[PDB]
Amino acid sequence: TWPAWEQFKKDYISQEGRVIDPSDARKITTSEGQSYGMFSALAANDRAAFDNILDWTQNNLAQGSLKERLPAWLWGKKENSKWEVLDSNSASDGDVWMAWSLLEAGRLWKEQRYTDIGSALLKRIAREEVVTVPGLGSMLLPGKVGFAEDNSWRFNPSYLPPTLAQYFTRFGAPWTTLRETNQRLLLETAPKGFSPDWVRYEKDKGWQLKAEKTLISSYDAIRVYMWVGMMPDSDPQKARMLNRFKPMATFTEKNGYPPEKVDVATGKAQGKGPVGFSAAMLPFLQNRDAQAVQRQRVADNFPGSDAYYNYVLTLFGQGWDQHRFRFSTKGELLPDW
Structure with a gap:
């Protein structure tokens, strides 16, 4: 048991598995927040939380599948009372923490499913938000669009x-x-x-x-x-x-x-x-x-x-x-653990 993580879940993680910043009127979730939740759940050996956070992420940020698309970076309340993606662009720090957490979960909990998702995510990060920059070589962009x-x-x-x-x-x-x-x-x-x-x-x-x-x-x-x-x-x-x-x-x-x-x-x-x-x-x-x-x-x-x-x-x-x-x-x- 990691007491600060337990209190974090209570304060900031919904029953449906979404990590919430309540300081914002939109009560937003980000791909970054989801990824830190997943990292912390793995660190805590909290597999139930990990699964729930992964589930919410795939359904709400990745239209059902992290194998098919990078997660939308921003999700929250719209003006019409509707809760949905607010920006479909990715944020690559969320993406990499999320891939790493999946790959390590797959290794440590011996679950091929996490490995498969983490691998497909990592490959997509490489395809979609890594570019060759003259003078530098391969660089990681902060997101799919708008940084190059x-x-x-x-x-x-x-x-x-x-x-x-x-x-x-x-x-x-x-x-x-x-x-x-x-x-x-x-x-x-x-x-x-x-x-x-x-x-x-x-x-x-x-x-x-x-x-x-x-x-x-x-x-x-x-x-x-x-x-x-x-x-x-x-x-x-x-x-x-x-x-x-x-x-x-x-x-x-x-x-x-x-x-x-x-x-x-x-x-x-x-x-x-x-x-x-x-x-x-x-x-x-x-x-x-x-x-x-x-x-x-x-x-x-x-x-x-x-x-x-x-x-x-x-x-x-x-x-x-x-x-x-x-x-x-x-x-x-x-x-x-």
């Missing part, structure tokens, strides 16, 4: 955790190249030690790292530091990424909290991140004292029932801090 145009692409460094990238390499191309190009994305777009929420690449011109509105480390990029922290200590990439992002650790150590927003071009930080940002620091911070300062903030300000975003970050970050799961050197789940 002639000679320009937009990426989200938080979308592919290095542990997942490692895992997928077992499936060959394009995942073998994507592991390396994902490293390039993380390392080359943080000139001042802070990863951007969003970043563009232009053919020949390269990364676009001059100051602009979304080139900041805030609500998306906070996950980058957390994914790096979750890498196994043995992995030599980890050291390299810890070094790159050291200025985030340094700010948090010095100030006693992570910032809300950091200008990626200048390194200038503003504001104080919410409790979920402190949870994200838990795997990332290597200093025992600084980690304990963040641990206290999460413990004393633990997210309630109307704090979906912070609760999601807390499941991952405090979850890791309490050994609720680990990742192997091959990106597999090492469950704590």
